[PDB]
Design a protein around this ligand. Structure first.
Ligand SMILES: *[C@@H]1O[C@H](CO)[C@@H](O[C@@H]2O[C@H](CO)[C@@H](O[C@@H]3O[C@H](CO[C@H]4O[C@H](CO)[C@@H](O)[C@H](O)[C@@H]4O)[C@@H](O)[C@H](O[C@H]4O[C@H](CO)[C@@H](O)[C@H](O)[C@@H]4O)[C@@H]3O)[C@H](O)[C@H]2NC(C)=O)[C@H](O)[C@H]1NC(C)=O
Ligand SMILES: *[C@@H]1O[C@H](CO)[C@@H](O[C@@H]2O[C@H](CO)[C@@H](O[C@@H]3O[C@H](CO[C@H]4O[C@H](CO)[C@@H](O)[C@H](O)[C@@H]4O)[C@@H](O)[C@H](O[C@H]4O[C@H](CO)[C@@H](O)[C@H](O)[C@@H]4O)[C@@H]3O)[C@H](O)[C@H]2NC(C)=O)[C@H](O)[C@H]1NC(C)=O
Ligand SMILES: *[C@@H]1O[C@H](CO[C@@H]2O[C@@H](C)[C@@H](O)[C@@H](O)[C@@H]2O)[C@@H](O[C@@H]2O[C@H](CO)[C@@H](O[C@@H]3O[C@H](CO)[C@@H](O)[C@H](O)[C@@H]3O)[C@H](O)[C@H]2NC(C)=O)[C@H](O)[C@H]1NC(C)=O
Ligand SMILES: *[C@@H]1O[C@H](CO[C@@H]2O[C@@H](C)[C@@H](O)[C@@H](O)[C@@H]2O)[C@@H](O[C@@H]2O[C@H](CO)[C@@H](O[C@@H]3O[C@H](CO)[C@@H](O)[C@H](O)[C@@H]3O)[C@H](O)[C@H]2NC(C)=O)[C@H](O)[C@H]1NC(C)=O
Ligand SMILES: COC(=O)CCN1CCCc2cc(-c3ccc(/C=C(\C#N)C(=O)NCCCC[C@H](NC(=O)N[C@@H](CCC(=O)O)C(=O)O)C(=O)O)s3)ccc21
Ligand SMILES: COC(=O)CCN1CCCc2cc(-c3ccc(/C=C(\C#N)C(=O)NCCCC[C@H](NC(=O)N[C@@H](CCC(=O)O)C(=O)O)C(=O)O)s3)ccc21
Ligand SMILES: *[C@@H]1O[C@H](CO)[C@@H](O[C@@H]2O[C@H](CO)[C@@H](O[C@@H]3O[C@H](CO)[C@@H](O)[C@H](O)[C@@H]3O)[C@H](O)[C@H]2NC(C)=O)[C@H](O)[C@H]1NC(C)=O
Ligand SMILES: *[C@@H]1O[C@H](CO)[C@@H](O[C@@H]2O[C@H](CO)[C@@H](O[C@@H]3O[C@H](CO)[C@@H](O)[C@H](O)[C@@H]3O)[C@H](O)[C@H]2NC(C)=O)[C@H](O)[C@H]1NC(C)=O
Ligand SMILES: *[C@@H]1O[C@H](CO)[C@@H](O[C@@H]2O[C@H](CO)[C@@H](O[C@@H]3O[C@H](CO)[C@@H](O)[C@H](O)[C@@H]3O)[C@H](O)[C@H]2NC(C)=O)[C@H](O)[C@H]1NC(C)=O
Ligand SMILES: *[C@@H]1O[C@H](CO)[C@@H](O[C@@H]2O[C@H](CO)[C@@H](O[C@@H]3O[C@H](CO)[C@@H](O)[C@H](O)[C@@H]3O)[C@H](O)[C@H]2NC(C)=O)[C@H](O)[C@H]1NC(C)=O
Ligand SMILES: *[C@@H]1O[C@H](CO)[C@@H](O[C@@H]2O[C@H](CO)[C@@H](O)[C@H](O)[C@H]2NC(C)=O)[C@H](O)[C@H]1NC(C)=O
Ligand SMILES: *[C@@H]1O[C@H](CO)[C@@H](O[C@@H]2O[C@H](CO)[C@@H](O)[C@H](O)[C@H]2NC(C)=O)[C@H](O)[C@H]1NC(C)=O
Ligand SMILES: *[C@@H]1O[C@H](CO)[C@@H](O)[C@H](O)[C@H]1NC(C)=O
Ligand SMILES: *[C@@H]1O[C@H](CO)[C@@H](O)[C@H](O)[C@H]1NC(C)=O
Ligand SMILES: *[C@@H]1O[C@H](CO)[C@@H](O)[C@H](O)[C@H]1NC(C)=O
Ligand SMILES: *[C@@H]1O[C@H](CO)[C@@H](O)[C@H](O)[C@H]1NC(C)=O
Ligand SMILES: [Ca+2]
Ligand SMILES: [Ca+2]
Ligand SMILES: [Cl-]
Ligand SMILES: [Cl-]
Ligand code: NA
Ligand code: NA
Ligand code: NA
Ligand code: NA
Ligand SMILES: [Zn+2]
Ligand SMILES: [Zn+2]
Ligand SMILES: [Zn+2]
Ligand SMILES: [Zn+2]
Lengths: 694, 694
């Protein structure tokens, strides 16, 4: 029989391992010839595997590269202008890769050029609250200072935006062992920790969903009109560069001025973590100087798009997508994901060769330039936005399959919760101690839901990956899944070797997943979701699960506002309309679910499959959120303080944030009330898409 | 049999006449008790007629009314401040209505209050080109002047916006006999001409699609957050008032300063039409003073929404809508339309009582507050926008059924051209001399297409009526049809008694349509279109007709740009991408049409009906046109110089308009190129919705 079990049994750990090895021998930086060569290889293999069509979709987008003959670095300079300390020009390459060429040195993509010199201020993680603490409580002024911030806790683009708004003239990012060195594990190559010469690459844009900085709204095709650089979306205005902790120690050790305000500001290095500004007495005349010479350049990128045409509803698309470009070798990010997609394609293609087709069309995507701002997925969705919003059933992302070896991690729309619970109950746990038990059982035991006993934790989608255009701009039901760590060590930093030259095939094979069993489990979860989405007669979405979370989010946002009881009285701020809408959604969703159970009529079916498919769509507001026109989903947006985190009822959340500091409270509370109305209206409108249609 | 012929034969001229009489005995001003009473009557009768559900949908919107105890008027004042001439306080009521109460006196809805005094400037029709002529050629400065403009040629809101941007401190509108008195016909009540005491009411907003000025984007429901008045959409900033030609003659006769620049500036009154400023020598110390005391007030309005549930595709909506509110009695506008809708509902309901249902759902709408800015249709579409954009097949408007008795007028999307040709070939001409001939034949003979022999003229949709939200904001295929005049007399002014107290039942019964045969023909055209849209197995849209017009519009816009060959060379302005997209659309549309002919499979059918339904939808750009976020259709928008007229490729048109006067040509031509890219991209994206789906 050709059923989900046939699909799942065809997936092989050994194949994933072979593909990962194949994808990680050389760097595949976006816009480079090697990444175009890999794109062509994937296109050819997906054709071989049996897909109906496999095309490259190319765009010309703004990318950023260091200057090969004018290297980026940072110095401590003395009063004569002699550079007495220089940060490294490259990470020491790992064993056996010391002759690999075209390893891009560490840099912050899209940094402007410049050579600013000044006194250092240490700003902890450079979060909104770190700058609050500096300016409001400690009275330290960052204006015209170079700030030094540790990576972790929030997306590095938000750190840079925060530093810029504080008046910094430059930003130095570094990896503190507190955040990137797990106690009792060795540094690469003898364990999975970050060595002191290791450095995390990454872009520092604030795109807010825009895609290519030069063509917001429209695909960067051959005849596109581009903005000039001065009007580009999301570029930083001050130079930025990342360093490892050997070099950071040299920059931090001489720091003077004020003490750290508390122990939450101290990392693990043998330094005081003084905030500054500037160095202690002996060295007070020394300064820090950055030298940044990277250039932004419009460069061609290539997505591979594979199609497996649906037998019954070819005009309904279930999308499995993940990126292919990497900073260096991409051992985890993204090739551990891409190897998993390759094996999924292979398995579906085996079934297709035996005569099977899925009910709905499955689209497979190998995205380019994800690392430079989700550019390949966003440009392709801008090109195809009309097809996607009228036909897009679901998008399953497929970046890194592992960031640990402890348990499953799922972030998705509430519409997929029941699908994920059901599927994981049918899959075998790969975990030691759970032999013969379901993935659901092991996952639930290791990662319990905070709300419900006997259920596992499933998080809201945030951002910083290729589902952003599909979910928060276009309103297509989206999900992601990977193996993860126990979050009770170095929390809200990912894995230590993230975006470093040390993220290699050997990292994975030796330290994360030697048997490729976690990879296989992740292929079963991602592939299984795609299979059910593309093949179930009734779409496997439960609208009642949206009703339950909407109430939780409404309680949360109400609780935030209720910290200001006097202002809620003065300005007549009521949440009644939002609770009413959520109550109505709950009642209508319950009734819709009864009809979905209680209806041989393919029009009623497809009518109801359309109501299911368009339910995520109904949370889109075509006017977008304030000053973020590409974040249109009213229930979920990336946190305005951390692109990685999701925020619920983001319009109301941002209206309430730090509201006690606004100069005009009547105007600020007016805007809170405006966002309440928008959210209540959108919830009610979404509910009404589930009512009887006539 | 229950087929279109059964539907059409059930329609009766005598019923339309009875309904028109019933709807026009008292005024039905939006927001008044009498208009709520009529709404309740229509709701009750549509239920009686057999519709499945009939609901009122109410909103609280900004309306505008004169102050009953502080009347609006204009004076000529002398140097002592004695008011030596006053304009009328009311139109002399027609025979037999001299005791009807609650006739709203003439006023310009949404005028601010004020009592400005100053010298008059006569500005012809107050068009963009009239102000160009004044400022650029004649060197007359309107700053701080009261302008007097004749009605006609363009929507009165554009006149006011143009006067405001010229620095006027007030606007006086009047009806010139040149534009509102047809040679050789008598004034009401003895003919259909405007008497000298007659005055045209009408709002002077510039909403650009926004709907209620206080709630752009969202329905004005019970919990809506409203903008303050200062941030409202579209309100004029200077007082405005309309007068008849007896009073205008008194204001114009003393005008001095410069002569009219040419005869296109002279109307029919026995006055010089001097432009001013101010009066001739003897009277140079006299001034004009306005007294405006109207108030804007949030007021409840009521739409009636009737549903006839579809038998096979209940989740597909074909909408017949027209408004019910009137300025006074609404003898033509809108009750000649509403009586026609009432009879259509009656006929469909007769068939329903015999057991028939249409294939798709038909929604019937009696809109409120159309006269105050399309408010009722727009608020309802804002409320239901998600249902309408995923389910809306078509919208047929149904305002005034007659504006003349000469021939048919149709303005619609190209997607309806073939439907209209086919239907009119099956209908009988009501015209004298065409007994036994088709409506198509009489219409084609009297109103030939300018492009094609043996075809009738069908115009682009403009605006100034309730289809605006459905077509230009939401991208639902839309059309309108009515009987019209021969446009070779007083051109681009409508009918003489438009928006006057004289627009009565007797006007229609005595002078326009004594046998109600033109009304019946219009009921057959509107009703027949609805019938085919709601009942044809394959949607009756021909995508090839869009391809033909796209080429015509691309040639037109290219020809405008080619007036500036030097700048097109300097700035590398090419239309190649737009022509390529139009060529592709033509090829893909031809192939789609072959498949539509060449496919028992209801999924392929409905898949292809979805491609047809979503084709108009594909011309929407969710970012809207520049500074007009609610005009989202890239092919059609209301002219930025005249809301009544449609403009094709409006983004490029506005970028090219008066471009030779821009101070920064590189920036201006850059924006032309940007709009070319947007238009070429949107045409190609629309074409690709017609490609094979996978
Ligand atoms: C959750 O779902 C419920 C439906 O079960 C919605 O309930 C509606 O709530 C609104 C209030 O926001 C009600 O609005 C009121 O309507 C009255 C007229 O209603 C009649 O006509 C409608 C046709 O639209 C019928 O549906 C209805 O059954 C009645 O026949 C108005 O008279 C009310 O206005 C008066 O009172 C208010 C409040 O004091 C004053 O401000 C006004 O000035 C005026 O005096 C009022 O507008 C509506 O009737 C309810 N519908 C139903 C079917 O019960 C909730 O709105 C929904 N939640 C959200 C967030 O949408
Ligand atoms: C009307 O419809 C036609 C399709 O019939 C479209 O034609 C496309 O036109 C674009 C130009 O805008 C072509 O783009 C060119 O693609 C080359 C690579 O194409 C290969 O890969 C694609 C996969 O996407 C295949 O479809 C294709 O068959 C080929 O296998 C590039 O190499 C070209 O770039 C080079 O030349 C340009 C121009 O000189 C330089 O600026 C570049 O720097 C570079 O050197 C170029 O990008 C595209 O190939 C065409 N497709 C097909 C199938 O023919 C029209 O675009 C469409 N009109 C509109 C408005 O959309
Ligand atoms: C830190 O690095 C700086 C800069 O060095 C340069 O850039 C780096 C990224 C590497 O690619 C280096 O190889 C590269 O040189 C060092 O300061 C520089 O020192 C050099 C050599 O001593 C100076 O060159 C001199 O140039 C003048 C020309 O007028 C001659 O008089 C001299 O004979 C000599 O050739 C150079 O001027 C100087 N540059 C700057 C910007 O200060 C620095 O020594 C190094 N510090 C360390 C390792 O502690
Ligand atoms: C044009 O109309 C103005 C204003 O008249 C008023 O408003 C109109 C819309 C109508 O509703 C009128 O019925 C209404 O009166 C006329 O000017 C006004 O004339 C009256 C009567 O002569 C003046 O009243 C005077 O008030 C003072 C109070 O201090 C006394 O000294 C007088 O005994 C007398 O009662 C009024 O002040 C004056 N108003 C203004 C604003 O000028 C005007 O006569 C008329 N012109 C015509 C018909 O040619
Ligand atoms: C209900 O739910 C809840 O309770 C919500 C809970 N909740 C609410 C409150 C606190 C909170 C915090 C977080 C996080 C904070 C830090 C996080 C992780 C990192 C940091 N700093 C990090 O760098 N990880 C590396 C892998 C991830 C990026 C990685 N992606 C990329 O590398 N992409 C590129 C390009 C991206 C782009 O340009 O946009 C890049 O980032 O450079 C991946 O996705 O694997 S996640 C998440 C949820 C959360
Ligand atoms: C291919 O095509 C082509 O060739 C396109 C050709 N083409 C291109 C170039 C020249 C041109 C000019 C025109 C016109 C110019 C003036 C016109 C008519 C009037 C004036 N002035 C007028 O007042 N008519 C009264 C009835 C119409 C309004 C009447 N509507 C209302 O009364 N509505 C209210 C509220 C509206 C709102 O608030 O928005 C109001 O207007 O007050 C109706 O629709 O019956 S139409 C049309 C097309 C055209
Ligand atoms: C990753 O795996 C791919 C797919 O197996 C490898 O690419 C493939 O490499 C082989 C051997 O080089 C190619 O076959 C050769 O073809 C040429 C003619 O073009 C011929 O001269 C040789 O004799 C040989 O038959 C094959 O085309 C190619 N397939 C692709 C790109 O689809 C790739 O080498 C692996 N990469 C690494 C780093 O291991
Ligand atoms: C995840 O799995 C659960 C458990 O199987 C699914 O819920 C179950 O769905 C079935 C099929 O629709 C329900 O069966 C129905 O039962 C009623 C009788 O009460 C009958 O009227 C229907 O004809 C039908 O037989 C079943 O009740 C229901 N079980 C529970 C506990 O809710 C669920 O649908 C799955 N989720 C997804 C997204 O697939
Ligand atoms: C326009 O036509 C409508 C519909 O025919 C007229 O309204 C209807 O008027 C009649 C007579 O007044 C109403 O019947 C009456 O009902 C009351 C009880 O409510 C009773 O006291 C009387 O004896 C009589 O039976 C009828 O309800 C009403 N129908 C509606 C509103 O649906 C209306 O009068 C006409 N208007 C004009 C201006 O001619
Ligand atoms: C308006 O009326 C015209 C004329 O009736 C309609 O065009 C006609 O549509 C029919 C039905 O699809 C076409 O018949 C087809 O003919 C081909 C053979 O060439 C065959 O392959 C198909 O199975 C089918 O029998 C017919 O060719 C076509 N006539 C013309 C002159 O184009 C048109 O569809 C109507 N428009 C609307 C919107 O309904
Ligand atoms: C990368 O840096 C080098 C310099 O280290 C740049 O080459 C110089 O560019 C300047 C300014 O245009 C010229 O005046 C010199 O003649 C060049 N010098 C040398 C030594 O080649 C180069 O332009 C930069 N590359 C990029 C892509 O920006
Ligand atoms: C319409 O106009 C009348 C005046 O002709 C207004 O009534 C006056 O309002 C003023 C200012 O608020 C009061 O001081 C007076 O006591 C009122 N005078 C009279 C004679 O009644 C009235 O407010 C206006 N109506 C509206 C709805 O604006
Ligand atoms: C910080 O320093 C700058 C530059 O000297 C100054 O202009 C600014 O006002 C200061 N801000 C605060 C909050 O002290
Ligand atoms: C793999 O699992 C073991 C057992 O818990 C753990 O000690 C080790 O740290 C894990 N490896 C990684 C990379 O997390
Ligand atoms: C018109 O008059 C005003 C007011 O006196 C003046 O400020 C303005 O500059 C003048 N404009 C032109 C174009 O002459
Ligand atoms: C009705 O038609 C006749 C015949 O052409 C014409 O003379 C008369 O003016 C028409 N009435 C109206 C209101 O146009
Ligand atoms: Ca873009
Ligand atoms: Ca509104
Ligand atoms: Cl992922
Ligand atoms: Cl109409
Ligand atoms: Na384990
Ligand atoms: Na290695
Ligand atoms: Na005639
Ligand atoms: Na009359
Ligand atoms: Zn990644
Ligand atoms: Zn990454
Ligand atoms: Zn009207
Ligand atoms: Zn009107």
């Amino acid at each position: 029989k050709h059923n989900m079990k046939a699909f799942l049994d065809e997936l092989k750990a050994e194949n994933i391992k072979k593909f990962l090895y194949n994808f990680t021998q050389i760097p595949h930086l976006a816009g480079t010839e090697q990444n175009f060569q890999l794109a062509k290889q994937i296109q050819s293999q997906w054709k071989e595997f049996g897909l109906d069509s496999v095309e490259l979709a190319h765009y010309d987008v703004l990318l950023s590269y260091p200057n090969k003959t004018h290297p980026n670095y940072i110095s401590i300079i003395n009063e004569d202008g002699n550079e007495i300390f220089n940060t490294s020009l490259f990470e020491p390459p790992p064993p056996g890769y010391e002759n690999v060429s075209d390893i891009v040195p560490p840099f912050s993509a899209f940094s402007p050029q410049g050579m600013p010199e000044g006194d250092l201020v240490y700003v902890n993680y450079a979060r909104t609250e770190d700058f609050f603490k500096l300016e409001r409580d400690m009275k330290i002024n960052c204006s015209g200072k170079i700030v030094i911030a540790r990576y972790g806790k929030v997306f590095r683009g938000n750190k840079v935006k925060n530093a810029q708004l504080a008046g910094a003239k430059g930003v130095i990012l570094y990896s503190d062992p507190a955040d990137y060195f797990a106690p009792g594990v060795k540094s690469y190559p003898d364990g999975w920790n970050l060595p002191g010469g290791g450095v995390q690459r990454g872009n520092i844009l604030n795109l807010n969903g825009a895609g290519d900085p030069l063509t917001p709204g429209y695909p960067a095709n051959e005849y596109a009109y581009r903005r000039g650089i001065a009007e580009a979306v999301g570029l930083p205005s001050i130079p930025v560069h990342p360093i490892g902790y050997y070099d950071a120690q040299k920059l931090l050790e001489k720091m003077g001025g004020s003490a750290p305000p508390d122990s939450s500001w101290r990392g693990s290095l043998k330094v005081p973590y003084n905030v500054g500004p500037g160095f202690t007495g002996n060295f007070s005349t020394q300064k820090v100087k950055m030298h940044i010479h990277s250039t932004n350049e419009v460069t061609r990128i290539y997505n591979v798009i594979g199609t497996l045409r649906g037998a019954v509803e070819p005009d309904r698309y279930v999308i499995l997508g993940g990126h292919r470009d990497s900073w260096v070798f991409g051992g985890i990010d993204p090739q551990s994901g891409a190897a998993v997609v390759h094996e999924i394609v292979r398995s579906f293609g085996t079934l297709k060769k035996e005569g099977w087709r899925p009910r709905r069309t499955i689209l497979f995507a190998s995205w380019d330039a994800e690392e430079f701002g989700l550019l390949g997925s966003t440009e392709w969705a801008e090109e195809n936005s009309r097809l996607l919003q009228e036909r897009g059933v679901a998008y399953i992302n497929a970046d890194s399959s592992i960031e640990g070896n402890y348990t499953l991690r799922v972030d998705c729309t509430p519409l997929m919760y029941s699908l994920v619970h059901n599927l994981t109950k049918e899959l075998k746990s790969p975990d030691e101690g759970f032999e013969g038990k379901s993935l659901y059982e092991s996952w639930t035991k290791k990662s319990p839901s905070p709300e419900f006993s006997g259920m596992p934790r499933i998080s809201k989608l945030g951002s910083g990956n290729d589902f952003e255009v599909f979910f928060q701009r276009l309103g297509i039901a989206s999900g992601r899944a990977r193996y993860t760590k126990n979050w009770e060590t170095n929390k809200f930093s990912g894995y230590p070797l993230y975006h470093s030259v040390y993220e290699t095939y050997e990292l994975v094979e030796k330290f994360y997943d030697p048997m490729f069993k976690y990879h296989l489990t992740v292929a079963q979860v991602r592939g299984g979701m795609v299979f059910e989405l593309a093949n179930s007669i009734v779409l496997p979405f439960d609208c009642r699960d949206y009703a339950v979370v909407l109430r939780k989010y409404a309680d949360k946002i109400y609780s935030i506002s209720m910290k200001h009881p006097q202002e809620m009285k003065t300005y007549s701020v009521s949440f009644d309309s939002l609770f009413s809408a959520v109550k109505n959604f709950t009642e209508i969703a319950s009734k819709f679910s009864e009809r979905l159970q209680d209806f041989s009529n393919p029009i009623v079916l497809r009518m109801m499959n359309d109501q299911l498919m368009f339910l995520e769509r109904a949370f889109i507001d075509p006017l977008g959120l304030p000053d973020r026109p590409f974040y249109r989903h009213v229930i979920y947006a990336p946190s305005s303080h951390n692109k990685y985190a999701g925020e619920s009822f983001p319009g109301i959340y941002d209206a309430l944030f730090d509201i006690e500091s606004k100069v005009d409270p009547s105007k600020a509370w007016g805007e809170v009330k405006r966002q309440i109305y928008v959210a209540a209206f959108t919830v009610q409108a979404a509910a009404e898409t589930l009512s009887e249609v006539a």
